[PDB]
Amino acid sequence: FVNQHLCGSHLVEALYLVCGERGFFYTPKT
Amino acid sequence: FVNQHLCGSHLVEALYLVCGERGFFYTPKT
Amino acid sequence: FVNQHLCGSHLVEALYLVCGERGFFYTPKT
Amino acid sequence: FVNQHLCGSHLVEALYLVCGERGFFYTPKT
Amino acid sequence: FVNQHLCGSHLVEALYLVCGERGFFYTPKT
Amino acid sequence: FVNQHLCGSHLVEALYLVCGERGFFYTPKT
Amino acid sequence: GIVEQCCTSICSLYQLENYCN
Amino acid sequence: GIVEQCCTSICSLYQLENYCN
Amino acid sequence: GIVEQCCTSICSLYQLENYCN
Amino acid sequence: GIVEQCCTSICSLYQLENYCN
Amino acid sequence: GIVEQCCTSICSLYQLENYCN
Amino acid sequence: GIVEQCCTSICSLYQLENYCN
Ligand SMILES: [Cl-]
Ligand SMILES: [Cl-]
Ligand SMILES: [Zn+2]
Ligand SMILES: [Zn+2]
């Protein structure tokens, strides 16, 4: 695999990809 | 706004647009 | 809801989301 | 170019790429 | 990582995220 | 049709669109 | 839940807003 | 219309171009 | 227009409804 | 192939990695 | 947080798993 | 390559067909 800049909707698309059924949180304020 | 029919990654895109800087949690069933 | 920068394909994705069955126009020249 | 099978938001993405700076109108049935 | 159910353009998005700067080849059947 | 900047996942989405069943290669190193 | 509802039936942006942090 | 045709059957980029402004 | 309102500047989902038919 | 497998059944990111250059 | 790690800086797919539930 | 032609510079849909198999 690789390391890249993932921002905005692309970041959440990647989380969906990687987490799937486990679910995830997207918390940009931190 | 209109009602939505959203599967897979399209749900995550919609949550991203709705929540913005607040972020969100994605929690599918089992 | 929130206010964010929405550009290009992401802008048209947001219009689709918000307008749906009503349809929309994307007219960047204005 | 090849023929396309496009539903939902994927149609709007295709229109965006085809029309570019001209923009476009999205008009679904009823 | 979780197993994936990916059709159409969603497969190409996943390949993009997996391969990064290496790039990839997309080769559907017939 | 038109000429535009197509980068990253958006570039591969456009290749999918244009090539479809023929398949394609995305080789950013060149 | 919301993930299943939006896909098997329909859902509103107002329902989606409940999943924001 | 075009939105239904592309989804239920198939459509070309040339057909899509008719919806540009 | 929409690009100036929503990309260059920022806009709400309600503002985006200005461009629905 | 991989394009059909991921869509008709399921596939892993590890299987996808085989299609990188 | 995630934006600093993955957008501002760069992160791997493994790092992204830090944000799964 | 493709990034230089289509991202850094600009390219047409016809140019993109250069990268089909
Ligand atoms: Cl972008
Ligand atoms: Cl889909
Ligand atoms: Zn983007
Ligand atoms: Zn889709």
Curated annotation (Swiss-Prot), chains G, H, I, J, K, L:
Disulfide bonds join 6-11. It comes from the Eukaryota. This is Insulin A chain. It comes from Homo sapiens. The gene is INS. The chain holds residues 90 to 110 of 110 of the full protein.
